[PDB]
Paper text:
Two sexual-stage surface proteins essential for Plasmodium transmission, [name] (5) and [name]/45 (6), are expressed in both gametocytes and gametes. [name] contains fourteen 6-Cys domains, whereas [name]/45 contains three. Here, we report the molecular structure of the endogenous [name]:[name]/45 heterodimer in complex with six antibodies with potent TRA as determined by cryogenic electron microscopy (cryo-EM).
The interaction site between [name]/45 and [name] was delineated at 3.4 Å resolution. Our structure indicates that [name] engages with all three domains of [name]/45 through its terminal 6-Cys domains, Pfs230D13 (296 Å2) and Pfs230D14 (1376 Å2). [name]/45 adopts a disc-like conformation in our structure with [name], with [name]/45D1 (1057 Å2) and [name]/45D3 (478 Å2) accounting for the majority of contacts with [name], while [name]/45D2 (112 Å2) contributes more modestly. [name] binds to [name]/45 on the opposite face of the disc conformation compared to the C-terminus of [name]/45, where the GPI linker is located for attachment to the PPM. Additionally, the [name]/45 N-terminus wraps around [name]/45D1–2 and, through residues 41–50, forms interactions with loops 2993–2998 and 3108–3114 and strand 3007–3014 of Pfs230D14. While the N-terminal region of [name]/45 remained largely unresolved in previous structural studies of [name]/45 without [name] implying flexibility, this region is well-resolved in the [name]-bound structure and reveals that unlike other A-type domains, [name]/45D1 features a different β1 orientation and connectivity, localizing to the interface. An analysis of single nucleotide polymorphisms (SNP) across [name] revealed that the interface between [name]/45 and [name] is highly conserved. Given that [name]/45D1–2 contributes 1169 Å2 of a total 1647 Å2 buried surface area within the [name]/45-[name] interface, it is conceivable that [name]/45D1–2 is sufficient for [name] binding, allowing for [name]/45D3 to retain a range of motion in the complex. Membrane-anchored [name]/45 forms a disc-like structure and interacts with a short C-terminal peptide on [name] that is critical for [name] membrane-retention in vivo. Furthermore, we could not find evidence of a [name]-positive population in [name]ΔCterm gametes in a flow cytometry-based binding assay using over 2,000 macrogametes. Together, our structural and in vivo experiments demonstrate that the C-terminal region of [name] is essential for the formation of the [name]:[name]/45 complex.
Author numbering:
A (entry chain A): 2044 to 3118
B (entry chain D): 30 to 430
The structure:
């Protein structure tokens, strides 16, 4: 009857290799844990039954142990199990009030594998009794007990002080999220000494990682009630604000993990600076596919000031995420310098063009020529266009490679948007810069200056050595270098979870608890360093190296002075930096970055201003070419592990017939390759300046070696004849691979057919750049391009208007109209339909669409896509797929009302498709579409409930908390009416106006067709912006009846009263906007 | 049944509309934006019958750089657009007008002006919203202007007085003494504006009648105890009985309005074989009796300083586009949908007196022109039936431009 190995902030009871609690002792052997305060609880039990872990430490003498249950202990892991009265078990996540971090671990040195059982305590208000047994199993009648365990978690919280967002269930539940609904809200309110927790549903993971140890720098205001002041360093009651050494700064050749863990980091230290009791699952949460990503933390007792921040769940399978708002309820700023006094401002960028083939002085002498030509076509459309701007350019021009541009959001220029007002110091400012950048565009952001950390180490190295730091721990497909107490085996996965931020090398670990590390600069910034690397995401931090695959960090340039040298991308050290937007991007998710300023070294919201910057990046849908060597490593992992079903990569990864080291890549124009090799591991580093040539000797080339690529002779073209600009700067050790591209036209003069150049990477894989006569035949047959300007069809009795598309670019037909442009001018209420194929239909197996979606990515400016609702609100969308003919159709009915001249373009392309006829090859073609609308007529006689639609509906009801309305509408024949309600709302009755109440018939639900057979209908259940709309038009109805609808919600209701009556109260003014 | 005239224009929820919005969130904001560079004119060139023209501006506390010129518009307005010469709006000679300044919204300030059709002379006043001084990275803002050319109504005013108040500036052609047996009957010429003064009128004053089928284009509005009745440009019969009831002095006064019948020869085209219909057309070219799908056309032309003409088209079948709310742009070798344009913009007149009728399968589209067009204009309406098409063209070469 005693206690165990309770270790205050850590809890452990090791029965595997602990002399205290091992079978070696012939006396009482048991342990007890009074766990508490969001701290880990480790149980390191012996092997129960022959398990596939190791041998020797699990010899025959040590193998006769067994106790129920012997469940799965490999990489696949279920919730930790706790034994009960019946000698059976129950899940620990329910035995205790919501356990998290239930993972198994083993020791590696000398193969001392043991079934380590770690789990982090959740909020608990009572003393919970969990009891185990430890039993020896030699054989029947020889089963003898030798110990037991007893977990006795204690009270540490109260129901009132604990707030939780159980995202699994509720109106805000994230499970129901789909392609149409992406996010739902939740919040936790915490006053002095409160408790907050997060629990993403199964299938989600918590981001940003290390939360809440480091969180957003949103708000920071002091409170007079505080009893202890703040220091911002490792001193006082906090233990953070130091940087790693032996994980990222000290590397060796054998370290191959550098680019595989650049996922999420770089968050600020405020919560640590604020003494917050932060607990996190590090960068590797539970196996969330069958577990809940959960975390907990507590408000510090001695600290009562104001802070704001948030963290998010995430899942890319359905583009669904959930935001978690965290704030201090003790908001002691409700009257001074709060959100009301926070001035909101906006900024526009300065635009230039990147030096794709130019140098420094060219920035002033030559890039003007590049800049002064692109916008001429946009000017032509703005002014010259009168009917329709077809693609009449068919000689002496190129488009794809010339669209590169550069954008800059300088705040040192616009000091007013980030600095305090010179005299009106009674307010604080907030600013937001918007950049609508596109592919092949360099984005460089300028902000105030703030520098990085500077760790230190000290020790009297003499007559002493530290050789007890050689051990690793393996769990969940990964091996970690960590440390263990020699006797008590007291450590933590929390230490492992934070090991991404710390490391130990040599013998210098003297007095770490007292550190006052500071930056070399004073100004506040978020993130502290490399903002363009750890890009902000509004209220979320992510690393751009892995989040945006293929991104290149471009060197900063404050000034090209006489002392200029090879600078770097480090921000905000010099306040300048640059990145490149890859042509291919996984998703359209936008990114941000924060900038700030202050007066002294210890400032806050009382003496600081906040600025924001926005840069948009386009998505992509077509897979890249090239070999991903890390994908070959993933294949070897698939050999290693079995639960890697999600084997998805963004590269086609062309495969040789028998060989894997070979990468037979064909240099095809109008294609992008993605050969992925870490940093400059590509060998030779001068490649392709120095390459090795092998010849077509073996068609499969199964018998090849990478080391052979060292002895070859080259006398063709030359060595230094063509030079390009720098596109890889290894100064940042987290840079991506080089990019290779080609223009719209290609030349056949310099090709070598029966020989291939090669380069090597990872010492195993071989790159092969080949060219085939098929490409030359394709270009020689496709160069002769014919363009036809056709017109569409229509009807007036039905008010229909549609074009013919699919019958034009068939690749199995002889072409005399290799390209066709379709322009069709429409008006209000016109139902446009677009028929296009996919990359599966016969003769269309390689069809792709540009822009990347007809419904949400149309073009508004020349070669610059934008959503339809951003400039053409109230547009109905319906994308469908045919059952048999593999035909994709879209509906693009124009909104009833338009206030300005409108003309947008959206194209198609089938040049990648071909077919074989009579042993001859017939290739694909290209097509384009243009639409013209102009203003509308008889603006909607209804009411809007979203505000932004104020120019489309007569009434614009801006929603307010617990609002009510009576939208009475009286319309006649040929009169347009409708309403718009928020998507999150529910239409009661459903499907209005399709089925509506009756004003006079006791609000009886009546079908729209039954009410009047001449009523055309069209509905928008949801749209991208998040609104719901309904449309109705009456056409020559010989009756005057009434009906009603109602938009309803928990905190908002809107009633629509409708009566049909011919009338005219318009003098036809039709307010004339010259635009 | 009976209510004061002014109450008939308040029977609407929310707002009545017809606002020149130049706020930051308005129709065309003046903020520096790369998305637009052209000038802004919310011009409404037309007669005004107590019509509401409203200017929406951002709050100065939110946009101090946003200027209002004149600062008290519409209380003070400009008369010289090029020179911006400020004069009090009352000095313009506007008759029985009123202005409002509504600021019951934290997001914007509203200015509303109502103008009566009783100005003795044509009045043109301008208000300017200037944001070009917003120097953001040397990106100047845009300028907006509200053009309100209050044209004196181009017809005589037949005013009848049945109130205890005096209208100083009205002709006062008729009064209570002219009501025989509490009934007054008057004749109105094509387009004449009839005005009745009465404190208590029926809600259907001049809105209903016995033979007023030809009188429906009227934009009947009520204000200052006055009921304004804008006669349509064209009628087909003399007996167009439009009735109203006034309760002045507790007496059931009856007012009857009828046209000064003079059928206007339509300076248009008639593609229908029914050349003896209720309408008369200058040009006629029957679609029938035409074989081999032979196309027909008729080039109608008009040219006069002032226009009191009737232009329209009569043809069997369907008109593509459905004239006259949309008509083809004449500039094309083939007048296909690519040339679709609004007639209100094609001939630069928004006061077109539309008049549509149908006889069996014959679609008749007519519209009246009063005044003059600032520029020479032309339009074409195509009539198609089965396999044959008829081309209608009007060229209105007014003495302008």
């Amino acid at each position: 009857t005693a206690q165990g190995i309770k270790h205050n902030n850590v809890h452990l009871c090791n029965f595997f290799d602990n002399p205290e609690l091992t079978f070696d002792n012939n006396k009482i052997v048991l342990c007890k844990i009074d766990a508490e305060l969001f701290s880990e609880v480790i149980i390191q039990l012996p092997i129960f039954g022959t398990k596939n872990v190791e041998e020797g430490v699990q010899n025959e003498e040590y193998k006769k142990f067994s106790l129920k249950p012997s469940l799965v202990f490999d990489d696949n892991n279920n919730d930790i199990k706790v034994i009960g009265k019946e000698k059976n078990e129950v899940s620990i996540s329910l035995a205790l009030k919501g356990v998290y971090g239930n993972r198994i671990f083993t020791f590696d040195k000398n193969g001392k594998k043991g079934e380590g059982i770690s789990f982090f305590i959740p909020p608990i208000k009572q003393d919970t009794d969990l009891k185990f047994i430890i039993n020896e199993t030699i054989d029947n009648s020889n089963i003898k007990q030798r110990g037991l365990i007893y977990i006795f978690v204690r009270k540490n919280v109260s129901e009132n002080s604990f707030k939780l967002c159980d995202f699994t269930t509720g109106s805000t539940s994230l499970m129901e999220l789909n392609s149409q609904v992406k996010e739902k809200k939740c919040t936790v309110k915490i006053k002095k000494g409160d408790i907050f927790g997060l629990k993403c549903p199964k299938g989600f993971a918590i981001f940003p990682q290390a939360c809440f140890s480091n969180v957003l720098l949103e708000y920071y205001k002091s409170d007079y009630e505080d009893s202890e002041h703040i220091n911002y360093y490792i001193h006082k009651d906090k233990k953070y604000n130091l940087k790693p050494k032996d994980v990222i700064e000290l590397m060796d050749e054998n370290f191959r993990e550098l680019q595989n863990i650049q996922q999420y980091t770089g968050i600020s230290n405020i919560t640590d600076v604020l003494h917050f009791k932060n607990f996190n699952l590090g960068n590797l949460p539970l196996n969330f596919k069958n577990h809940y990503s959960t975390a907990y933390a507590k408000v510090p007792d001695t600290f009562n000031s104001i802070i704001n921040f948030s963290c998010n769940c995430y899942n890319p399978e359905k583009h669904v995420y959930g935001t978690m708002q965290v704030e201090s309820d003790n908001r002691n700023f409700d009257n001074i310098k709060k959100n009301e006094n926070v001035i909101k401002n906006f900024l526009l960028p300065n635009i230039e063009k990147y030096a794709l083939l130019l140098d420094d002085e060219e920035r002033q002498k030559k890039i003007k020529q590049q800049q002064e030509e692109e916008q001429q076509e946009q000017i032509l459309k703005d002014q010259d266009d009168r009917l329709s701007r077809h693609d009449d350019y068919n000689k002496n021009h190129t488009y794809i490679l010339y669209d590169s541009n550069e954008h800059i959001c300088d705040y040192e220029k616009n000091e007013s948007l980030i600095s305090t007002l010179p005299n009106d110091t009674k307010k604080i400012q907030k600013s937001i810069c918007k950049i609508n950048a596109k592919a092949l565009d360099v984005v460089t952001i300028k902000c105030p200056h703030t520098k990085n950390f500077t760790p230190k180490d000290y020790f009297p190295n003499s007559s002493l050595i530290t050789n007890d730091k050689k051990i690793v721990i393996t769990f969940d497909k990964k091996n970690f270098v960590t440390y263990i107490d020699p006797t008590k085996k007291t450590f933590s996965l929390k230490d492992i979870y934070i090991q991404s931020f710390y490391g130990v090398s040599l013998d210098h670990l003297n007095q770490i608890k007292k550190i006052h590390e500071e930056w070399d600069d004073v100004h506040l910034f978020y993130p502290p360093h490399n903002v363009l690397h750890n890009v902000v995401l509004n209220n979320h931090i992510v690393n751009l190296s892995s989040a945006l695959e293929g991104v290149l960090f471009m060197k900063s340039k404050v000034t090209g002075d006489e002392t200029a040298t090879k600078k770097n991308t480090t921000l905000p050290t010099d306040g300048v930096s640059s990145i490149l937007i890859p042509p291919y991007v996984k998703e359209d998710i936008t990114f941000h970055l924060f900038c700030g300023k202050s007066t002294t070294k210890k400032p806050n919201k009382k003496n600081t201003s906040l600025a924001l910057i926005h840069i948009h990046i386009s998505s992509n849908r077509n897979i890249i070419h090239g070999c991903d060597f890390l994908y070959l490593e993933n294949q070897t992992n698939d050999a290693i592990s079995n639960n890697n079903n999600n084997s998805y990569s963004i590269f086609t990864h062309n495969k040789n017939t028998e060989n894997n080291l070979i990468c037979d890549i064909s240099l095809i124009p109008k294609t992008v390759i993605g050969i992925k090799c870490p940093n400059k591991k590509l060998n030779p580093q001068t490649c392709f300046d120095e390459v090795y040539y092998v010849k077509q000797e073996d068609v499969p080339s199964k018998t090849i070696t990478a080391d052979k690529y060292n002895t070859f002779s080259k006398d063709k073209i030359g060595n230094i004849l063509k030079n390009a600009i720098s596109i890889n700067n290894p100064d940042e050790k987290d840079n991506t691979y080089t990019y290779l591209i080609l223009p719209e036209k290609f030349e056949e003069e310099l090709i070598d057919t029966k020989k291939v150049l090669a380069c090597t990477c990872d010492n195993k894989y071989i790159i092969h750049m080949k060219i085939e006569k098929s490409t030359m035949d394709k270009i020689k047959i496709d160069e002769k391009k014919t363009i036809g300007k056709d017109i569409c069809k229509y009807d007036v009795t039905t008010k229909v208007a549609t074009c013919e598309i699919i019958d034009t670019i068939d690749s199995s037909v002889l072409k005399e109209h290799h390209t066709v442009h379709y322009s069709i001018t429409l008006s209000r209420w016109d139902k446009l339909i677009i028929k296009y194929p996919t990359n599966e239909k016969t003769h269309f197996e390689n069809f792709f669409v540009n822009p990347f979606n007809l419904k949400d990515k149309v073009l508004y400016n020349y070669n610059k896509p934008i959503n339809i609702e951003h400039i053409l609100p109230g547009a109905i969308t319906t994308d469908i797929y045919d059952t048999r003919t593999k035909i994709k159709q879209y509906i693009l009915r124009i909104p009833p009302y338009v206030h300005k001249d409108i003309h947008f373009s959206l194209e198609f392309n089938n040049s990648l498709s071909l077919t074989k006829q009579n042993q001859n090859i017939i290739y694909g073609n290209v097509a384009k579409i243009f639409i013209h609308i102009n203003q509308g007529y008889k603006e909607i006689h209804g009411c809007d409930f979203t505000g932004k639609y104020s120019h489309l509906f007569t009434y614009s009801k801006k929603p307010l908390p617990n609002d009510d309305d009576i939208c009475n509408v009286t319309i006649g024949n040929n009169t347009f009416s409708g309403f718009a309600c928020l998507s999150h709302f529910e239409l009661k009755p459903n499907n209005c106006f399709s089925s509506v109440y009756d004003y006079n018939e006791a609000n009886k639900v009546k079908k729209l067709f039954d009410l009047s057979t001449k009523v055309e209908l069209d509905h928008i259940k949801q749209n991208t912006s998040g609104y719901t709309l309904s449309y109705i038009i009456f056409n020559k109805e010989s009756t005057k009846l009434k009906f009603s609808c109602t938009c309803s919600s928990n905190y908002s209701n809107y009633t629509i009263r409708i009566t049909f009556d011919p009338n005219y109260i318009i003098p036809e003014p039709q307010s004339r906007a010259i635009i | 049944d009976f209510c004061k005239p002014s109450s008939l224009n308040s029977e609407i929820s929310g707002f009545i509309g017809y606002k020149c919005n130049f706020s930051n969130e308005g129709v065309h904001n003046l903020k520096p934006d790369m998305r637009e560079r052209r000038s802004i004119f919310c011009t409404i060139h037309s007669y005004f019958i107590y019509d509401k023209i409203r200017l929406i501006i951002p709050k100065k506390s939110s946009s101090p750089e946003f200027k209002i010129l004149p600062e008290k518009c519409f209380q003070k307005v400009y008369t010289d657009y090029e020179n911006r010469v400020e004069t009090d709006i009352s000095e313009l000679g506007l008759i029985e007008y009123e202005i409002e300044e509504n600021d019951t919204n934290p997001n914007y300030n509203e200015r509303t002006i109502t103008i009566s059709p009783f100005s003795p002379k044509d009045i043109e006043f301008f208000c300017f919203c200037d944001n070009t001084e917003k120097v953001i990275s040397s990106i100047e803002g845009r300028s907006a202007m509200v053009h309100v050319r209050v044209l004196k109504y181009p017809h005589n005013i037949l005013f009848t007085n049945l109130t205890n108040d005096l209208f100083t500036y009205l002709p006062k052609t008729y009064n209570e003494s002219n009501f025989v047996s509490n009934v007054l009957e008057v004749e109105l010429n094509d387009g004449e504006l009839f005005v009745l003064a009465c404190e208590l009128i029926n809600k259907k004053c001049f809105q209903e009648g016995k033979e007023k089928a030809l009188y429906k284009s009227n934009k009947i509005i009520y204000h200052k105890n006055l009921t304004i009745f804008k006669a349509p440009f064209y009628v087909t019969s003399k007996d167009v009985n439009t009735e109203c009831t006034c309760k002045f002095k507790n007496n059931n006064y009856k007012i009857v309005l009828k046209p000064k019948y003079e059928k206007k020869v339509i300076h248009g085209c008639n593609f229908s074989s029914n050349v003896s219909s209720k309408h008369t057309f200058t040009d006629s070219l029957d679609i029938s009796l035409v074989d081999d799908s032979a196309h027909i056309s008729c080039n109608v032309h008009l040219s006069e300083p002032k226009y009191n003409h009737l232009v329209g088209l009569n043809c069997p079948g369907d008109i593509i586009p459905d004239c006259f709310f949309q008509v083809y742009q004449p500039e094309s070798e083939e007048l296909e949908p690519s040339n679709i344009v609004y007639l209100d913009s094609q001939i630069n007149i928004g006061d077109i007196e539309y008049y549509e009728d149908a006889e069996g399968d014959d679609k008749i589209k007519l519209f009246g022109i009063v005044g003059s067009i600032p520029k020479t204009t032309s339009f074409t309406c195509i009539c198609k039936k089965d396999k044959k098409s008829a081309y209608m063209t009007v060229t209105i070469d007014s003495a302008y431009y």
